[PDB]
Swiss-Prot record:
Gene3D superfamilies: CD59. GO terms for molecular function: toxin activity. This is Cytotoxin 1. It comes from Naja oxiana. The lineage of its organism: Eukaryota, Metazoa, Chordata, Craniata, Vertebrata. Transmembrane segments: none annotated.
């Protein structure tokens, strides 16, 4: 489907069928730099431990 960025920002993954959006994960510690990135269909709500940011364009995360 779409393409989002790996942890390595110079390499992307193709999203699975049905998934569209690109998400990145933070930890409450390192809010500055996200720790994991991938594709998803529905943007996961923020947790107490890790924060989720999604965006609806390619290689945005």
């Amino acid at each position: 489907m779409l393409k989002c960025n790996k942890l390595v920002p110079i390499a992307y993954k193709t999203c699975p069928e049905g998934k569209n959006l690109c998400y990145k994960m933070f930890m409450m510690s390192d809010l500055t730099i996200p720790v994991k990135r991938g594709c998803i269909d529905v943007c996961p709500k923020n947790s107490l431990l890790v924060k989720y940011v999604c965006c609806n364009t390619d290689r945005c995360n």
